[PDB]
């Protein structure tokens, strides 16, 4: 039986952050990837 092979989801990770001396909170962007695949 023929099966298709596809590399599983991968991407870059970017950190969105204001200045350190405004706040320490950051957000994370996973490029070209579902939110479901993140964990």
């Amino acid at each position: 039986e023929i099966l298709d092979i596809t590399p599983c989801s991968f991407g870059g990770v970017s950190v969105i952050t204001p200045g350190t001396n405004t706040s320490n909170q950051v957000a994370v962007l996973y490029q070209d990837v579902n939110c479901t695949e993140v964990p």
Partner: peptide, 22 residues
């Protein structure tokens, strides 16, 4: 008229076509 993996990644443009049209 204009119509046309292994680490390759295509980043989306900051301005979409709709915003450029606007």
């Amino acid at each position: 008229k204009v119509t046309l993996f292994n680490g390759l990644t295509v980043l989306p443009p900051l301005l979409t076509d709709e915003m450029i049209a606007q």
